[PDB]
């Protein structure tokens, strides 16, 4: 896949992703907050199309993500991120994609996700999260 | 004057300022680093003009500011920042302006200045600095 | 169980834990670093005894934890932490306990675990980690 790294920002305003239940997460893009203004991050696109789009529009700064969860698994001989869920202080978004394979979860007791990095081929291969107070 | 607040970024690439040797500091603009890319900050401009411009172009990321110092004192009835000096690990930039009145200084043993806020009318009235690891 | 919260320190010198090959993790105590000296954390013990103890002595400061993983699942009708594994930049310690139920893992790309909190009854019920640069 193609690596991406958005870097760190002041918060998150919106996550645009896409997914396919037959396969995995595809595209991933974030509108960050940068010092009180929207920062439109680059759209990290699957090499293919055919995904369902999802727009997670957060009530920034009142609403913030408190847990990111999902599943990794084999799709076509590749280990990829098959499903994602974002829980905020207000609502749960997802799961997006099938909840099958090896689970993972990052609950946050204190602090904020302020950035994403990872790699996307046909599907989201892997990702990491920048955290800050 | 007009309050300004750039917020916090990843680092500092260039500082532009202006000053007059008989009054005080006038304009102030920073080119920040944002996750390895230049981010050109808002230009905080004096209400008047005729100042002498100064461009401090740092050898980012190896060169970084270790000490900010200056003087405050009264100009035409207004207590303002009359002089500024920026010491990096490479060299000293300044003093710019008039070095008379009450000195101040912020040396940093560990950490980085990553943003500026303050107020500018005819002259720079005051400023604060965002610090990060 | 009984809640505990060690708070945050400046890093980790030793982890002592206990476990049983048929139930789950029992006791938990950490020797933290504080400002370059050892600080012996409270020993969070199970309500019962009979576990196998394990001492994980890190070569601090060059050796540090880079991933904590394990399993949660039901023992006598309670969700508990059944297994833990600590991977450092030098070695893997564990798994200790019973590796079944639902896996979890916290890899860290940048930063340090500097504290633990949680709750222990007959077994470790849940835990969280303090992270810092």
């Amino acid at each position: 896949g193609k690596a991406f790294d958005d870097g760190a920002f002041t918060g998150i305003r919106e996550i645009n992703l896409s997914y396919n239940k037959e396969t995995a997460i595809g595209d991933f893009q974030v509108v960050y907050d940068l010092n009180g203004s929207p920062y439109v991050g680059q759209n990290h696109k699957s090499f293919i199309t055919g995904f369902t789009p999802v727009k997670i529009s957060l009530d920034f700064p009142s609403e913030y993500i408190m847990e990111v969860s999902g599943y990794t698994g084999n799709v076509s001989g590749y280990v990829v991120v098959r499903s994602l869920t974002f829980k905020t202080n207000k609502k749960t978004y997802g799961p997006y994609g099938v909840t099958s394979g090896t689970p993972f979860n990052l609950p946050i007791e204190n602090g904020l996700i302020v950035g994403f990095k990872g790699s996307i081929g046909y599907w989201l291969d892997y990702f990491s999260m920048y955290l800050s107070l | 004057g007009k309050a300004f607040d750039d917020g916090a970024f990843t680092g500092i690439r260039e500082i532009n300022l202006s000053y007059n040797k008989e009054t005080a500091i006038g304009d102030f603009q920073v080119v920040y680093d944002l996750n390895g890319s230049p981010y050109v900050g808002q230009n905080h401009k004096s209400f008047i003009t005729g100042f002498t411009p100064v461009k401090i172009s740092l050898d980012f990321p190896s060169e970084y500011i270790m000490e900010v110092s200056g003087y405050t004192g009264n100009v035409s009835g207004y207590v303002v920042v009359r002089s500024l000096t920026f010491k990096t690990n490479k060299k000293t930039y300044g003093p710019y302006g008039v070095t008379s009145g009450t000195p101040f200084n912020l040396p940093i043993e560990n950490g980085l200045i990553v943003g500026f806020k303050g107020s500018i009318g005819y002259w720079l009235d005051y400023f604060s600095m965002y610090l990060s690891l | 169980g009984k809640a505990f919260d060690d708070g945050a320190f400046t890093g980790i010198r030793e982890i002592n834990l206990s476990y049983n090959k048929e139930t789950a993790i029992g006791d938990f105590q950490v020797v933290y670093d504080l400002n370059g000296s050892p600080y012996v954390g409270q020993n969070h013990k199970s309500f019962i005894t009979g576990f196998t103890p394990v001492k994980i002595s890190l070569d601090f400061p060059s050796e540090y934890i880079m991933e904590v993983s394990g399993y949660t699942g039901n023992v006598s009708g309670y969700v508990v932490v059944r297994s833990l594994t600590f991977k450092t930049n030098k070695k893997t310690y564990g798994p200790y306990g019973v590796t079944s139920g639902t896996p979890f893992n916290l890899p860290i790309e940048n930063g340090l675990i500097v504290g633990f909190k949680g709750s222990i009854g007959y077994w470790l019920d849940y835990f969280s980690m303090y992270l810092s640069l």
Partner: peptide, 15 residues
């Protein structure tokens, strides 16, 4: 270095 640092957790997914 003049670049500031942040905690980063992960990655989850493929090696």
């Amino acid at each position: 270095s003049g670049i500031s640092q942040t905690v980063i957790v992960g990655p989850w997914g493929a090696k």
